[PDB]
XYZ file of C-alpha atoms in Angstrom:
206
model
C -9.403 4.600 -17.171
C -6.005 5.834 -16.135
C -4.993 6.064 -12.484
C -1.848 7.844 -11.491
C -0.556 6.556 -8.163
C 1.800 8.932 -6.433
C 3.898 8.243 -3.350
C 4.310 11.544 -1.539
C 5.374 9.767 1.623
C 8.975 10.092 2.837
C 9.267 6.303 2.803
C 9.008 3.741 0.056
C 5.677 2.079 -0.470
C 4.737 -0.803 -2.622
C 1.541 0.106 -4.421
C -0.936 -2.624 -5.227
C -3.978 -2.703 -7.481
C -6.337 -5.667 -7.664
C -9.966 -6.477 -8.198
C -9.786 -9.465 -5.851
C -9.371 -12.343 -8.333
C -6.953 -10.550 -10.719
C -4.272 -7.858 -10.844
C -5.152 -4.492 -12.261
C -2.421 -3.680 -14.754
C 0.858 -5.063 -13.348
C -0.818 -5.334 -9.912
C 2.003 -3.804 -7.903
C 5.198 -1.820 -8.011
C 7.703 -0.192 -5.732
C 7.236 3.567 -5.357
C 10.132 5.503 -3.870
C 9.347 8.841 -2.294
C 8.014 11.054 -5.038
C 7.548 8.404 -7.684
C 4.394 8.173 -9.792
C 3.043 5.039 -11.401
C 0.382 5.320 -14.101
C -1.862 2.319 -14.611
C -4.682 1.512 -16.989
C -7.857 -0.055 -15.590
C -10.321 -1.730 -17.952
C -13.649 0.139 -18.207
C -16.366 -1.732 -16.417
C -14.047 -2.835 -13.611
C -16.154 -3.549 -10.560
C -14.681 -3.823 -7.048
C -11.169 -2.512 -7.787
C -8.922 -1.535 -4.924
C -5.648 0.317 -4.676
C -3.546 0.339 -1.533
C -0.030 0.778 -0.252
C 2.106 -1.791 1.388
C 4.892 -0.973 3.825
C 8.166 -2.579 4.770
C 8.325 -5.083 1.994
C 11.197 -7.410 0.959
C 10.946 -9.162 -2.388
C 13.457 -11.400 -4.171
C 14.229 -11.251 -7.926
C 11.198 -13.505 -8.684
C 8.829 -10.851 -7.042
C 8.182 -13.055 -3.978
C 8.533 -11.821 -0.429
C 6.631 -10.269 2.485
C 5.263 -6.846 3.520
C 4.362 -5.727 7.034
C 1.097 -4.145 5.883
C -1.072 -5.046 2.913
C 0.788 -8.215 1.885
C -1.078 -9.990 -0.943
C 0.085 -13.600 -0.565
C 3.772 -12.718 -0.735
C 3.767 -11.267 -4.283
C 5.071 -7.960 -5.639
C 2.358 -8.093 -8.293
C -0.877 -8.581 -6.385
C -3.684 -10.733 -7.753
C -5.581 -10.805 -4.494
C -6.430 -8.207 -1.856
C -3.928 -7.409 0.858
C -3.813 -8.362 4.494
C -5.058 -5.593 6.827
C -4.322 -3.032 7.938
C -4.753 -1.262 4.588
C -6.236 2.086 3.838
C -8.277 1.352 0.668
C -9.078 3.311 -2.447
C -12.135 1.549 -3.850
C -13.788 1.981 -7.209
C -16.344 0.603 -9.547
C -16.117 1.974 -13.064
C -18.772 2.535 -15.764
C -21.667 1.250 -13.693
C -24.723 2.392 -15.643
C -22.860 5.440 -16.933
C -21.259 6.402 -13.576
C -18.028 5.750 -11.665
C -18.141 5.236 -7.879
C -15.128 5.924 -5.693
C -14.489 5.860 -1.959
C -11.872 5.491 0.657
C -12.432 2.844 3.285
C -11.038 2.150 6.742
C -13.083 -1.072 7.044
C -9.813 -3.027 6.739
C -7.909 -0.607 8.911
C -5.420 2.062 8.048
C -1.728 1.980 7.220
C -0.947 4.993 5.054
C -2.801 8.335 4.551
C -4.381 8.744 1.157
C -6.092 11.150 -1.194
C -8.221 9.738 -3.945
C -9.213 12.435 -6.482
C -10.486 12.579 -10.086
C -8.092 14.189 -12.539
C -11.027 14.857 -14.928
C -13.980 17.225 -14.308
C -17.321 16.628 -12.575
C -16.847 15.276 -9.024
C -14.707 15.911 -5.922
C -12.082 13.709 -4.296
C -11.931 12.142 -0.843
C -9.117 11.952 1.607
C -8.121 10.306 4.833
C -4.908 12.052 5.926
C -5.136 12.085 9.705
C -2.554 10.395 11.890
C -4.615 7.317 12.566
C -1.571 5.248 13.354
C -0.274 7.592 16.057
C -3.718 7.928 17.678
C -4.715 4.263 17.154
C -6.318 2.617 20.237
C -3.922 0.206 21.908
C -5.955 -2.941 21.133
C -6.107 -2.053 17.411
C -2.382 -1.284 16.960
C -0.693 -3.654 14.562
C 2.948 -4.497 15.617
C 3.849 -4.438 11.913
C 2.715 -0.799 11.634
C -0.810 0.431 11.111
C -4.125 0.463 12.864
C -6.330 -2.556 12.408
C -10.098 -2.490 12.182
C -12.011 -4.172 14.959
C -13.358 -6.923 12.702
C -9.846 -8.099 11.921
C -8.802 -8.046 15.578
C -11.865 -9.397 17.396
C -13.796 -11.395 14.782
C -17.272 -10.673 16.179
C -20.540 -10.483 14.291
C -20.930 -6.895 15.518
C -17.623 -5.611 14.183
C -17.686 -7.733 11.016
C -21.402 -6.992 10.404
C -21.859 -10.665 9.614
C -25.660 -10.702 10.071
C -26.021 -7.571 7.953
C -27.189 -5.827 11.093
C -24.592 -3.983 13.096
C -24.091 -0.512 14.449
C -21.204 1.819 14.923
C -18.784 0.923 17.714
C -16.250 2.624 19.878
C -13.656 1.435 17.389
C -15.480 2.452 14.249
C -16.148 5.886 15.773
C -12.406 6.411 16.211
C -11.817 5.903 12.467
C -14.792 8.079 11.681
C -13.764 10.940 13.986
C -10.336 11.150 12.335
C -11.559 10.486 8.792
C -15.206 11.353 8.300
C -14.991 10.876 4.514
C -13.905 7.231 4.717
C -16.070 4.196 5.482
C -15.539 3.270 9.141
C -17.643 0.088 9.265
C -19.616 -2.022 6.836
C -22.970 -0.201 7.258
C -21.563 3.283 7.667
C -23.534 5.980 5.881
C -21.949 5.895 2.375
C -19.178 8.357 1.589
C -19.211 7.089 -1.988
C -18.609 9.790 -4.541
C -20.355 9.550 -7.927
C -18.241 10.677 -10.844
C -18.877 10.677 -14.603
C -18.374 7.326 -16.323
C -14.788 6.932 -17.584
C -13.245 9.548 -15.311
C -9.521 9.329 -14.576
C -7.990 9.488 -11.143
C -4.972 10.083 -8.966
C -4.281 8.240 -5.716
C -1.767 10.080 -3.578
C -0.132 8.430 -0.561
C 0.701 10.848 2.227
C -1.065 13.729 0.499
C -0.143 16.299 3.188
């Protein structure tokens, strides 16, 4: 499947794509304002994520630091990024279907649209100003709005026992972005697309 990743933000982002134990494609790249990066993702990929990282510094070996979404100090991510990170999540070719969603379970850093570029399903978006509205205790100094699990490390926020409910903090994410997952057991906002669809992830879509 092909994913086009577009930075419509006014600032540079460093896109990342990983399935947790491996890069997808090159695994990350700098995207200046307006730049588009097309990647290929192996059919059958399960548990892929795309995200943006902000305020990164990398040397010539691709080693450095980002203020949001840092994946162990690498330009080319192999692992998932440190919250807060708005996440585009997908599982491809799962019994003939693709499943996509946007999640705020690991917080929010950059607004995002995640849309098929082929026919037969609709996209999802979280484009509200979550950072500006972020509750004080969730605000990350680096930029971004952390989820409550990351900040407080309770069973309730992290849904560790597999039983948990919505919280004041999850409801904030949900009020601003109803189409994104706000906590682990949120009612699914997963969209089902045809197997082998193609997609575009747009940072700062509006």
